[PDB]
Paper text:
Pol μ is capable of performing gap-filling repair synthesis in the nonhomologous end joining (NHEJ) pathway. Compared with replicative DNA polymerase, Pol μ lacks proofreading activity, with an intrinsically high error rate of 10−3–10−5 for dNTP incorporation. Here, crystal structures and kinetics of Pol μ substituting dGTP for dATP on gapped DNA substrates containing templating T were determined and compared.
To further investigate the possible roles of these two residues in dGTP misincorporation, crystal structures of Q441A single-mutant and Q441A/K438A double-mutant proteins complexed with 1-nt gapped DNA and dGMPNPP were determined (Complexes 4 and 5, respectively). While the templating T exhibited a further shift to an alternative conformation, dGMPNPP and the flipped 3ʹ-end dA of the primer strand in Complex 5 adopt a single conformation, similar to that observed in Complex 4. Compared with WT:DNA structures (Complexes 2 and 3), structures in which alanine was substituted for Gln441 (Complexes 4 and 5) exhibit a much more stable dGMPNPP, indicating that Gln441 may play a role in discrimination against dGTP misincorporation over the templating T on a 1-nt gapped DNA substrate. Notably, the Q441A/K438A double mutant displays a remarkably high misincorporation rate of dGTP vs. dATP (80.4 × 10−2). Steady-state kinetic measurements indicate that the K438A/Q441A double mutant has an overall misincorporation efficiency similar to that of the WT protein. Given that wobble T:dGMPNPP was observed in the structure of the double mutant (Complex 5), these two residues in the major and minor grooves appear to interact with the templating base and fine-tune the active site microenvironments of the incoming nucleotide binding.
Author numbering: 139 to 365, 383 to 397, 410 to 494
Write the structure that this text describes.
DNA sequence: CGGCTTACG
DNA sequence: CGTA
DNA sequence: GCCG
């Protein structure tokens, strides 16, 4: 099928090298502002992840969605020579390496990285010498960059969840913490830990996240956070280690229980899976999907879901467990 | 050709 | 602009 | 860059 939400995509697969190469080109397209080419290369990479066996000859790409002349030539050169000249040229270019380094900083997007690049900046130390150019968020990202470049491990995640649950249970007894993001899809490591928080009584979650953050702050666990009312927090946590501690990015989201299936579906991802599912919803079904609900514009009504299963059924899609949403 | 991702901080 |  |  043409959309990633119509097929299972496991975490590990049989075309790792080919998909990695196409994702380099996708990433390079994004650094140059070409969102359309980024999407096509990401989609072609995702198709290969969904295949049941390795691609060994060009003919296997026949009829595969999102493979045209450019992506097929990339695959062809990898099959024939083990390397793609275009991909290798991107890898070693100063532009790619610096945009990759800069955009990996928490608080730095493509627009900011591109301005710094054009101004001649190239390294983290270059940015550190110009702290007048940095927001407080970027200063935090730069200071903690080395720890944040270390993958979070599944072992780390359970220790963090207990701490978050402790603060959440004091902020509002009966509130729950659900692991979402990449670790919910089965990843053994990640760039951060994502949590979704709710309470079984509609309305009780109002105003919860400031109370949660206050309690985490008082426990001494918050190295950075954005802080009147808010429902999403992007922070840097102090995580325990043997004889020391390390900084870890943690995302917290609060949703009312009525919206929990939609929020769980959205924040579980993958990011490409979510965009493809929303695109499918809008273009094939005429329904508008987000992390709050599923809207029929013609009837001006919202579909009530009690589960992610509900949502897949309402879109006419076979259910995909989180481990099969690794588009 | 137009379309390509979303709401919140 | 950033979360990304 | 590719789809419809
Ligand atoms: N609508 C929407 N959702 C998004 C977007 N980006 C991410 N999400 C949703 C879907 C994502 O699954 C979720 C969390 O995003 P991360 O924590 O940045 N990534 P993950 O946990 O997959 O991996 P790792 O942390 O190891 O890099 O947020 C976006 O641009 N749009
Ligand atoms: K960034
Ligand atoms: Mg994550
Ligand atoms: Mg996250």
């Amino acid at each position: 099928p043409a959309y990633a939400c119509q097929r299972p995509t496991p975490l590990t697969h049989h075309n790792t090298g080919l998909s990695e190469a196409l994702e380099i080109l996708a990433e390079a397209a994004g650094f140059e502002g070409s969102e359309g080419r980024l999407l096509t290369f990401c989609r072609a990479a995702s198709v290969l992840k969904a295949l049941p066996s390795p691609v060994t000859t060009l003919s296997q790409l026949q009829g595969l969605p999102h493979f045209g002349e450019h992506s097929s030539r990339v695959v062809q050169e990898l099959l024939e020579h083990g390397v793609c000249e275009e991909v290798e040229r991107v890898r070693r270019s100063e532009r790619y390496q610096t945009m990759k380094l800069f955009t990996q900083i928490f608080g730095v997007g493509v627009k900011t990285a591109d301005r710094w690049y054009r101004e001649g900046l190239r390294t983290l130390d270059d940015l550190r010498e110009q702290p007048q150019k940095l927001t407080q968020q970027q200063k935090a990202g730069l200071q903690h960059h080395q720890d944040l470049s270390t993958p979070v491990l599944r072992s780390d995640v359970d220790a963090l969840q207990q701490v978050v649950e402790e603060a959440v249970g004091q902020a509002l007894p009966g509130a729950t913490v659900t692991l979402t993001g990449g670790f919910r899809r089965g990843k053994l490591q990640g760039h951060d830990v994502d949590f979704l928080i709710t309470h079984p009584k509609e309305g009780q979650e109002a105003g919860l996240l400031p109370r949660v953050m206050c309690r985490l702050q008082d426990q001494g666990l918050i190295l950075y956070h954005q802080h009147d009312a808010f429902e999403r927090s992007f922070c840097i946590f102090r995580l325990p280690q043997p004889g020391s501690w390390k900084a870890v990015r943690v995302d917290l989201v609060v949703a009312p229980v009525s919206q929990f299936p939609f929020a769980l579906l959205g924040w579980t991802g993958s990011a490409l899976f979510a965009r493809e599912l929303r695109r499918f919803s809008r273009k094939e079904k005429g329904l508008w999907l987000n992390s709050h609900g599923l809207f029929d514009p013609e009837q001006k009504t919202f579909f009530q879901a009690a589960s992610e299963e509900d949502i897949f059924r309402h879109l006419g899609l076979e259910y995909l467990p989180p481990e099969q949403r690794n588009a």
